[PDB]
Each structure stands twice: as structure tokens, then as C-alpha cells.
């Protein structure tokens, strides 16, 4: 039901998503005098917001398979469309990290999200922060799909918190599509089981938690 | 009046409040290479803002026993409900910091708030900056409770100012539930009373100053 | 004309203005490990924003003698009230820096807006950056007086631009009330005229420029 | 069609645009002790946001000839006015960077935008970050011209992201008038062509991508 412009918007968003979000964390993860560490989180959070303004009213700016999933679980999102977005997201992302592999000549750690210390630390973090994000994503979404000025602020804000804090433990992802892309350009795949089960379990738990308390 | 979903909202918010705000101040106060010092202030303000968008229209997104007190005094909040939130906040906070003592294993100062100079520095700050916070919280609440896009911007900003400045003196808390959780998940109960009297005297004073200039 | 509650809002705002903006600038300019330098800009701009949300609909959130003057000149504000407000701003600032002198014992330059090198560098910056403020302050004012969600964003943002850049040259004040407060509790009185001729001459010029382009 | 107030509004912005975005980038680009590296990215973004609040409803706050262009191709902007804004931007930029040359006397690199590595690195960034900017500029435009509270947040956000990331590769400009202004104020012209193809080739690309996904 009008899924072409939805998926072009979902790919073009996920590309500019990953291209920006890793390219500052990857560059920063190679010279912190070149791009600040708080600067790679702020950059990563701002970019989520502007894609909600760009494609939020068209596709919904899902950009996140564990979110497209969470919408299909809780607010009636077309199950016949979730494969098309999942596809659309993984594509724009994986494409980007390679596009940067070439634009950031010296550095070949393109924002790897790899667990720090005990691998489970990340999982508890990657569910609590993903829960957090999906929780607020759901309290602000308008069902065309995550639309509007404050939807951009809420989700971008949540995401930014994740880079600052969950970045010290998990690297801070919450998005199976965005760990995978970079993991391929730098061939480091340490702990990927957590960047699927943290999120999928984080979005569904947090989304479920919202529908619980839903009306006042 | 329909308080089950309200107190679930007040724990899940105060938990997510402390979990990120302390989880980042705890990591940061251990390796400033691992999390920035300005990043743990920003973290503190953003989490308040997004929690206002998520539970603000349901519970009121108080996430603070010294505020639920302050609204019940001035802007008609249910007194049979203030024990019930105090329960929800002190819980979600105490619950949160413990989840972190473990999730940030090796670091065990779980973002606590303890005075820096003479304790009255903190107490005077923890009333002036807390006076500040409740002041604007009260000017933007619409009474369902602290709800709406700019309600989140105001409070998040206020909290963010507090981490930066009151962080140098008091640690910048303004929230008794957020002090106990951490003070308990590790230890140190240093100045624990100013983080109970600074706030309660700060939120009530700040609310009264606004209700005056209405 | 109903000026009683109007002027209390202007001291509590100007007090809370300086208590944070100087109280963080004073600590920070002393141990840059104790409070970040980017953190002292962000702090100072945020506080302007929250005061505009607090008292903007009551007083207008002037907090600035170069503002109350400029509103009195261009968007018809009461001359019977410009003295009563000018009082409220010079007080809340002077009171705060002293209230700070004690809460921050070891540090005793309680914020300083003091020129860097050539004094004319500061006066030129202190009118152009002050031009920035009054220009936008006027484009977003609703005349009850600087009211509304984006009034807080516009002005708060502008002030933050000033701390970052004009902080490197002048210290970034734009405020006759804000220079006096710290200069009295810190007891450093350099260039005090540029913080009266920079501001007073900067806002009047910037307001005139908005009233000029007023139409599209 | 009522262009006097329109072009005076376009210069005063581009003056205050460059005066601060470079005045902080230059001061920062010398002594990072006097202005932080993230502070000159943030400042670069706040100024775009507040200028949209000041002149967005009058001229539209393009502040960018490659953007003033980008609107003429896609959302019907007066070709008899494209010269008059181009003039206005190239003017206010060149004038401002000179105003600072003198106001920051011992430091005389007045916030230049100069490439880093392979010049194609810089250019490839200056189109995708410029693509990003124009893409969202288009999803939030209201046509009098880029007006409104969230219009400022998106555009300023796009700019702030670019300074963080594209500053590490291209210097992060996306604006031919803003590369020229500083380049003249202290003699520097390396890769000046990417800052004329990065933008022009970048804004047009980003706009078309939205007009594609125009609907839902």
C-alpha cells in the first residue's frame, strides 16, 4: 500500500543515518583530537532527529529492524511491509559503511560496536537503553509513522543518551542494522548475538511497557 | 483515580532516569576517557526530557519525591497518592543503581552525590538550583502533569544546568530518590541530609515563588 | 501598570541567571577539570532559556538593562516601568555573584567579563554579538513579552553562541547587570564601560535592524 | 516583489552567520584553550538555527547561494532574485570575515575551510553532508521561506552535524559563500572548487531526493 516511496525514504534515511553516525565515531575512534568523543554522540543523535523530520511523515523513519518489528507487534504496522523495510534499512546502512571505507582513507575501524568486558553487560544495557528508546518512540509516534517535531526530539534525544552511556558498555547500538554495516567494513564481529537480542528484546519489552500504561 | 498505570510509569521512569543518569556519571567519574564529564551532564538532561515525553502525560513524570511533594502542596495533587509515588520513585531509583553496580561491574561508585567543599555549599546550592528547577517545572506544567514538548525542554535544561554547576559543589542532584539509590548501591551517605533537606526546602520555595508571580 | 509581580519575576530571573552563569563560569575558569569550558557556555545559554519559559509571559524575561531599554525604545514598553525593571536586573545580578562568592569558597573571581588583550576588540564583539541577541529577541517576541517555546530556543541559543565565541574575546556578557554583579563580588572592574556601551549600543542597533525588515 | 527588506535581511544574517561560525572556528582553530573544537561545531549550528528564527519569515534565511539556487530549481523561487541574494550572501560573508580579521588581531586565520586528505575526500563529503542538509531543508520548508520553530531545529541540526563530521574531512562547509568569505580574509584557497561543487552538486541532489518521495 504505497510502499515504494516508503522504502526509498527508508533507504535514503538509513544511509545518511549510518554514513554520519559511524563516520564521526569511526574517525573519532581513531583520533579524538580530530573529532571529539562527546562530538561523536551529539552528531549521532542529531542525525536521528533530522531523519524523523525528513522521512518521518512518509515511511515513519523506522531505520531500525527491531523498531519496524516493534511497530508490527504493537501498533498494527503492515507485516507485509516489515520485510520491505528490514530490507530497506540493512541496505542503506551496509552501503554507507563501505562508502566511508573509501572516504576516510586511513582509518578502518568504522564505528565498531563491540562489547566491553563481560559480553552480557552489553545485553542488559542494550535492552534497558533500547527499551528506553522504544518506550519513548512509542509515546510520541503518530502512526504516519513516527511523525512530528517532538517525535524527532524525543527519539533523537534517547539515542543520544545511548551513545554517551551505553557506548561505554555496549558501544551503544540498539539497531541490528547499524551494527551489521560497520561490522562488515572492518570485519570485526565480536558479540553480534547481543546486537540482535538486546534490541529485539529491548524494543518489544519497552514497547509492551508503554501499551501497558497507555491511557492515563 | 487510575494509579496502577501511574505508579508503573513512575518506577519505569525513575529507573530509566537513574539507570542512565547514574550509569553515565558512574562510568564517567571513573574514566573520563570512557565517558566525557560534559557527556554525563547532557545525559542527565536528555533523560529527564525524554522521560517527560514518555510518562509525562500519564504519571506527570515526577521521578522525584521532592517534587511530588511540591506539587501536592501548591497545585492540588492527591495526598493519598504522594506516599504511593514516594514508593515508586525511591523504588525505581534504588532498583536502578543496583542494576548498575552490576552492569558497570568494576566501577562501584555508582554515580553518587556527595559534597565538595563545606557541606553547606551543597545545601545552599541544592536549594538555589533546586529552587530554580521547580520554578520552571511549575511554569510549564499544564496539570496532566508535566506534559508537552516544551515541558520536557524546560526541565531537561534545568537538570542539565544543575549537573554542570551544582556538580562542582553539591554533585547536583535535587532528587532524594536519585541520591539514595546510588548511595545504597555502593555506599557513602555523606551529606545525605542536604540531599533530603536541600531539595524539600528548594522545591517548595521555588514553587511558592512562581505561584506568587502568577 | 501591574508592575509588582512583574519586577519580582525580574530579580528571581536575574538572580538565577547569574547564580548559574557566573557560578559556573567562576568555578570553571578555576578548575577546568571541575567544570568544562564548553560546559560553561551550554550552562549559560540553557539558563536564559529556562527563565524565558518561567517568567517570559510575566515580565517578558528581560534580565538585561540593554534589553528593557531596547524594548522600551521599539516595541512600546512602559517608561514608567523601565526604571523599576532596570533596578530588578542590576540587583538580582549583584546579589547572585555575592551569593556565589560564598558557595564557591576557594574561587574568588566570581565570573569575570574582562577584556582579552585590546579593549576595543571586546567593545566591537560586545555590540555585534549583542546585535545578534536583540535582533532575534525581537523577531520572536510576542509582547507579553518574550514569550513562548521558540522564544526560549532562539534567545537561549543566541546567548550560547556568545559564550563560546565572545567568551574568547570579551568573556561574553552582553549585559550591564551581569558585568556589575561579578565585578563587585570578584572585585575586578576592567572595561566596565564597554559592558555599558557595548550592550546599550548593541541592543538598540540590533532592534532597529529587525524593525526595519519587518514585512517580507 | 518587496526585495529591499528581503536582501537586507539576507546580508545581516550572512554577516552574523560567518562572524560567529568563523569567529569561533578561527579562535578555536588556534588556541583550543580559548574556544573548544566541539564548541565551534555547536556554535556553527546554533547560529543557523537562530538566523532562521530572525529572517526565516522574511527572506527565508538561505544564507547559501547553493541553497538559494536549490530552491529555485525545485520550489519555484524568483530567478530575478537569485542574483540579488547571491550578491547579498557573497557580500555579507566577505564583509564579516574581514570584520573579524581585525577583531581577533594576533590570530589571523579567520576560520578557513580547507581540505584535509585526498581532495576527492573533501568533495565527496561536501556533497553527502550537503545532500543531507538540503534533503531536510526541503522536508521542513514552509515557503516564506524556511520558516518556523522546527525549521530552525532541523537546519541548524544538519549544520551542526556537518561541522562535527565533515569538519574532520572537508572542513565541513556546504556553502560557497561561506568558503569564499574566510578564504579572502586571510589568503587561503586550497580545494576552493570542492566548496563550489560540494554545495551546488550537493544541495540539488538532496532536494530532488525529497521531491521524489514527496508524498506518503
Swiss-Prot record, chains A, C, D:
Subcellular location per UniProt equals: Cell membrane
Q: Does the keyword Nucleotide-binding apply?
A: no
Mention any one GO cellular component term assigned to this protein in its UniProt record: plasma membrane
Query: Per the record, what is the consequence of mutating residue 88 to T?
Result: In lsi; impairs silicon uptake. Grain discoloration. Reduces grain yield 10-fold
Q: What upregulates or represses it? A: Regulated by silicon level; the expression being decreased 4-fold by continuous silicon supply for 3 days.
Q: What is the topology of this protein in the membrane according to its UniProt annotation?
A: Multi-pass membrane protein
Q: What is its main location?
A: membrane
Which Gene Ontology molecular function entries are recorded, alphabetically? channel activity; silicate transmembrane transporter activity
GO terms for biological process? silicic acid import across plasma membrane
Short sequence motif NPA 1: positions:
64-66
Which ranges belong to the motif NPA 2?
A: 175-177
Q: Where is the chain membrane-spanning?
A: 7-27, 41-61, 80-100, 122-142, 150-170, 193-213
Tell me the keywords, alphabetical order. Cell membrane, Glycoprotein, Membrane, Repeat, Transmembrane, Transmembrane helix, Transport
Tissue specificity annotation = Mainly expressed in the roots. In roots, it localizes in the main and lateral roots, but not in root hairs. Within a root, it localizes on the plasma membrane of the distal side of both exodermis and endodermis, where casparian strips exist (at protein level). Expressed low levels in leaves and anthers.
Function statement:
Silicon influx transporter responsible for silicon transport from the external solution to the root cells. Is coupled with the silicon efflux transporter LSI2 in both exodermal and endodermal root cells for an efficient silicon transport across the cells into the stele. Silicon is beneficial to plant growth and helps plants to overcome abiotic and biotic stresses by preventing lodging (falling over) and increasing resistance to pests and diseases, as well as other stresses.
> Which family would the database say this protein is a member of?
Belongs to the MIP/aquaporin (TC 1.A.8) family. NIP (TC 1.A.8.12) subfamily.
Recorded domain comment: Aquaporins contain two tandem repeats each containing three membrane-spanning domains and a pore-forming loop with the signature motif Asn-Pro-Ala (NPA).
Q: What is this protein called?
A: Aquaporin NIP2-1
Q: Which organism was this protein described from?
A: Oryza sativa subsp. japonica (Rice)
> Which residues of the intact protein are shown?
45 to 260 of 298
